[PDB]
Design a protein around this ligand. Structure first.
Ligand SMILES: NC(=[NH2+])NCCC[C@@H]1NC(=O)[C@H]2CCCN2C1=O
Ligand SMILES: NC(=[NH2+])NCCC[C@@H]1NC(=O)[C@H]2CCCN2C1=O
Ligand SMILES: [Ca+2]
Ligand SMILES: [Ca+2]
Lengths: 200, 200
């Protein structure tokens, strides 16, 4: 009975990656970089704040599972110290907020395990998954799931509109946010899904 | 196995109210007014932004149930227009963040039903329930439950610490927030509970 709203590059499968544990450092297509505190440079480099896709496939050295979906995850890595701000992915949809409708936003959240060239992947920065109408956060899961090194869990965000919602007709949106509340301050997302169902 | 952390005036039962549907307009004891955008006047009046307790007992004209707990609920009413900011209740606890511990914060959220002297109680401003360590929001439920006129639902907020959490030893805190994202822009809370359990 719930209808899916299509999401562009919903599984971070674009771009295609050939080598397990390789990654990009440029915003994945379908998404924009959400960067209210100007943490992410326009000219991207490894080992500085960035986002992109990572190939989590057979033989990965940094996870205890494959990607939740397909080959790739999407990641946001912030090198600034905890407390410096929040950043992540945003996607504004063509779909608009409808009255007497329940929205269900689901996304898998994970993080690296282990260490790399002296940088520990122990610890987690906190995540927030947001459903938007216009620039309003209708509903969000601020860090309620415990995200273990190298593993993913599914976040569920729900919003129910009324017949007189202030935000009716505004574009729906999704944000996937690195809260930078601790280190290691990289975070992964995959398999974004959004459904709509009329209320009874 | 989960241990309760005591909360002062956890059910907004203080002060005691004699008459059903009567209310106070002063901060309930045990709590402070969270008011980052300076919406709430120090000199309180009815029909302006305020908070207090309300007696939701037999014969109430504005609910479809009694208070979730005891006689009273705690409310936050904001008369400013949607988008003006957020405000609510805060309580900072003596308890501090411990390592390898799961925290479970539960609170009932509700709102008035009907109308009063020309002001409609239709609509809802959005809620957020926050668990803090120091000034950090560890975990929050931003408006995931649909809160029907005159009824309450239970919000659950969870956080799991690590052995190296940045915020270990900082005071735990609770915020109960009116998001002022729509009107009618009054919101109720009751029956605040916080438990701790060691992780396996
Ligand atoms: N292949 C993956 N699953 N993820 C790639 C993560 C890349 C991300 N950005 C970087 O520049 C590297 C530097 C070291 C840690 N990194 C990160 O955490
Ligand atoms: N008795 C209750 N359950 N709630 C009392 C709510 C009081 C709160 N504050 C006020 O000043 C009144 C003005 C009209 C609407 N009010 C509100 O919503
Ligand atoms: Ca994927
Ligand atoms: Ca009570």
């Amino acid at each position: 009975s719930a209808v899916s709203i299509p999401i562009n590059n919903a599984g971070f499968e674009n771009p295609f990656m050939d080598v397990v544990d390789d990654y990009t450092i440029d915003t994945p297509p379908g998404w924009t970089t959400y960067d209210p505190n100007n943490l992410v440079p326009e000219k991207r480099t490894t080992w500085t704040s960035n986002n992109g896709v990572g190939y989590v496939g057979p033989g990965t050295q940094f996870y205890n599972q494959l990607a939740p979906e397909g080959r790739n995850i999407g990641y946001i890595y912030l090198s600034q110290n905890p407390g410096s701000g929040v950043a992540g992915f945003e996607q504004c949809l063509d779909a608009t907020l409808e009255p007497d409708t329940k929205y269900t936003l689901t996304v898998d959240v994970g993080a690296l395990a282990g260490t790399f060239k002296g940088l520990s992947f122990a610890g987690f920065p906190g995540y927030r998954v947001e459903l938007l109408a216009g620039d309003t956060v209708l509903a969000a899961d601020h860090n309620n799931l415990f995200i273990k090194e190298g593993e993913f869990k599914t976040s569920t965000v729900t919003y129910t509109s009324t017949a007189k919602d202030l935000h009716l007709g505004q574009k729906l949106g999704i944000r996937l946010v690195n809260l930078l509340q601790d280190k290691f301050s990289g975070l992964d997302f995959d398999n974004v899904r959004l459904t709509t169902e009329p209320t009874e």
